Amino acid sequence: YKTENPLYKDDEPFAKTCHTFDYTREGTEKNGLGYYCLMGLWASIFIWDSLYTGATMPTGVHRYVWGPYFPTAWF
Amino acid sequence: YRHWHRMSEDDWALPLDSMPEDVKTLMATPQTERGFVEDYWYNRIRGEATLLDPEALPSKSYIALARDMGLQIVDEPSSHMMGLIELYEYLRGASFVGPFGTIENPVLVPAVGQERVVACTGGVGDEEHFTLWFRCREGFMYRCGECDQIFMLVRLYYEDRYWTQTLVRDTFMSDGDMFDLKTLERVHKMWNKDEMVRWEVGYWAQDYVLGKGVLPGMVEEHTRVN
Amino acid sequence: KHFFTDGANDYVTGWENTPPLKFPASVMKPCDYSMTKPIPKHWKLRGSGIHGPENTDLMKLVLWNRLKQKRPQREVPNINYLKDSIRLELSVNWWLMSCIFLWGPWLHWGQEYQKVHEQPPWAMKRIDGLRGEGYFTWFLE
Amino acid sequence: QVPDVFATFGWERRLTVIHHPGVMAISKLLDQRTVVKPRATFNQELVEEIGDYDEDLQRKAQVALDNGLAIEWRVLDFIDDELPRLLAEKREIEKAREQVMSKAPGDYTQPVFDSSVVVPTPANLGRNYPTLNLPSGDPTE
Amino acid sequence: ISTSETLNQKILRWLDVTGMLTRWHSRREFILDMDPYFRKNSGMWTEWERKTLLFLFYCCTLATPYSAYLDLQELKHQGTKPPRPVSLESRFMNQRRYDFTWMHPQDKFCSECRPVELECKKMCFDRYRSMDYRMYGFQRPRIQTYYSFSTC
Ligand SMILES: CCCCCCCC/C=C/CCCCCCCC(=O)OC[C@H](COP(=O)(O)OCCN)OC(=O)CCCCCCC/C=C/CCCCCCCC
Ligand SMILES: CCCCCCCCCCCCCCCC(=O)OC[C@H](COP(=O)(O)O)OC(=O)CCCCCCCCCCCCCCC
Ligand SMILES: [Zn+2]
User: Fold this and answer.
1) How far is residue E85 CA from its own chain's centroid?
2) Measured between CA atoms, how close is B134 to chain D, in angstroms?
3) CA distance E16 to B83
């Protein structure tokens, strides 16, 4: 006969009844990419705020090719 | 039931030290006169005596086999009582939900006393109303003043006693032919020989019939220190 | 899990709302009669009709929830369950390892550097003329 | 015709259900742990894994597997001496199974076999096996 | 030096002087090191559970010496704590509305000293002793007592 080691079997599913538990659509099982994007931004803000300490005090002098009303003049 | 706690060791079997030492009288006592411990060991000794005799089982009827093991053949009277008993026990820690009660089929309210407090919540959906509590006393067909749901009290009462598994077994089960101690001895020699005991209960039981301490190793088994 | 929950982590009584999946539906099934077909009019109500042990599935659930308490061997859970059972324990142990082999070394280096240069290696050297080690968490300054 | 019976469980808190008289008789029979015995059947895969925990049992389990024996663990510890009886026992059980199965319905006569080699039976109630949990080696060698 | 074993085996044998490694690599040896009452429940354990338990236990016991080292250094540091400048009595420093007596409501020992101000109490005890009243403490030099953690 053939057998399966119980330690490596898969988790049993929830029973299908009138009262059924379903977590598949919640998306709360694990941290997603967005969470890791928050961590990356936090690291970035932390490094940036220390590396460039004059960023919060910018220069008001602006040239801006194609004037101020061109899209690349807002970033 | 969900309201019960964890099975005890006793819920499965009893220690052999709780076997009555006067086995000869135990096997001759009528069922109505046997206590809980006495009834446990009467059934176990007699039931295992028949089960440990393979050559006789095929020729034994289910009526006789059930009697030997102490199992009660079911009938409508006993089924009704047992069922209402188990329904009472379930309602101890469970909700009370069922079909809408009418004159033909009133809501059945089991009780031991002559009264039980009951609440009517009305029908399903929009026919459900706020809880209306009333005291359901025996002998009256109650009608909710709001939804006209009919209620009735069912009493688990029999002959100055309430309904229990023990009461149902005593009232409906009939003692058969008196247990023969020769069967105990015969089966004892079958499974217990030359220092091998394959029927421990029958080795202890035969020892008591012999007077306690007669069989090999039994004096040492009965000698305790505290 | 550590905390007891009647619905999920019910270890005090071991009650389970549904039978094991191993059992065939003909042997035991979850108590669900919501799909019962309409009763013929010529049928008559014999039982109470009340939700309870008169229903076969509920009866078997109660029976099994008591007779399952004695079993010849263990029902080995899979490694996922075992990991979850001691998740906090393992994580705390790794936290201790981090505190010894990560926090320990750089904290020692900072103090040794402080001895020679008066301030930790992650701080701005002062010129005000005040004396002492000063702050340690530089990002909370 | 088979009558229905009440089967009750529990000592102080008793739960009653309806059951089959024959199924209850089998249940109580299997509770006679000294009479009805569980026996193990091996496969080559599992025999090899046993060696990871008990080398001696692996060798003895291999013998049982090679002869296709369903053997109790206590007997397995003495398979070197019990092997001739175990082979004889295997034959007798097979003969009996065949005879009873092949018999026509309603024929409940006992099978014809040599019960002296089958354990546990009235004819041979077994042997008093000595414990083998005794060290036999000198730690200083 | 034994040559009947490899270098790795020798090192592992010596780390197994207390049998820790043997109990890890042998289930039988682990269960037979349990006291009989608890050995009864051993057969139910998985090998995952067993080795994980040993790992948690071994990590803990192997870090206790490190914590002990860290604690000894702490005691030595406190035992020879450097003197600090006497505090100038600033605008809001050393304000008192009543004497310190909550420790001794009736006896009122060292009413002027603070609860754990050891030097003030020593001089206060000396006054009481000079007044024929015995008080305990603050008389033995630190280097002449055991467990002081102030010896060279
Ligand atoms: C071909 C590739 C080769 C790669 C080689 C990589 C080599 C990497 C070597 C890393 C060495 C790190 C050494 C760290 C030593 C720290 C010692 C120290 O601080 O000890 C004291 C300090 C506590 O001091 P306190 O006085 O209490 O003060 C602080 C708290 N108040 O103790 C500790 O921190 C305990 C922990 C010590 C950890 C030592 C880490 C050693 C790591 C070695 C890694 C070797 C990797 C080799 C890789 C080879 C790949 C081919
Ligand atoms: C009582 C005090 C409690 C402590 C302090 C609370 C602070 C407020 C509450 C914070 C709670 C956060 C919990 C963690 C949630 C989490 O990680 O949540 C994770 C989620 C993603 O979810 P997933 O894990 O499913 O992907 O993160 C996001 O939704 C963001 C994704 C990354 C976005 C990167 C770019 C952000 C740009 C922000 C610009 C801001 C400009 C502001 C101008 C004024
Ligand atoms: Zn109503």
Assistant:
1) 29
2) 31
3) 64
- Provide the 8-state DSSP code for D134: -
Q: How far is CA E27 from CA A7, C9, D50, E31, in A?
A: 17, 30, 12, 6
Give the number of other CB atoms < 10 A from CB of residue B20. 20
Residues sharing a CB contact under 8 Å with residue E21, sequence separation 6 or more, in sequence order: E12, E15
Three-state DSSP at B192 gives strand
Per-residue burial over D26-56, b = 16 or more CB atoms within 10 Å of its CB, e = otherwise: eeeeeebeebeeeeeebeeeebeebeeeeee
Give yes or no for D45 touching A (CB within 8 A). Answer: yes
Q: What is the DSSP letter of B143?
A: E
E56 and C90 Cβ atoms separated by less than 8 Å: yes
Write down the experimental method used for this entry: cryo-EM
Neighbours of chain D (3+ CB pairs under 8 A): A, B, C, E
> Are the CB atoms for B23 and B46 separated by under 8 Å?
no
Q: Is the dihedral of CA E139, E145, E146, E149 positive or negative?
A: positive
Cα–Cα distance list, B211 to B29, B43, B181, D39 (Å): 18, 21, 14, 38
In angstroms, the Cα distances linking E128 to A50, E118, E121, E131, E135 are 61, 15, 10, 5, 7
Tokens of C115: 């001895």
Neighbours of D8 (CB within 10 A): 17
In angstroms, the CA B137 to CA C52 distance is 23
Residue B23: count of CB within 10 angstroms of its CB: 22
Residue of C29, C80, C138 to mutate when probing chain A, most A C-beta within 10 A:
C80
- Considering only CB atoms, A11 lies closest to which of C17, C76, C78, namely C78
Q: What is the CA radius of gyration of chain A?
A: 27
Asked if B51 lies within 8 A of D122 by C-beta distance, the reply is no
In sequence order, which residues have a C-beta less than 8 Å from that of residue C8 and are 6 or more positions away?
Answer: C1
Whole-number Cα distances in Å, B126 to D69, E93, E150: 69, 73, 84
Q: Are D17 and D28 in contact (CB under 8 A)?
A: no
Ligand 1 midpoint to CA C121 (Å): 18
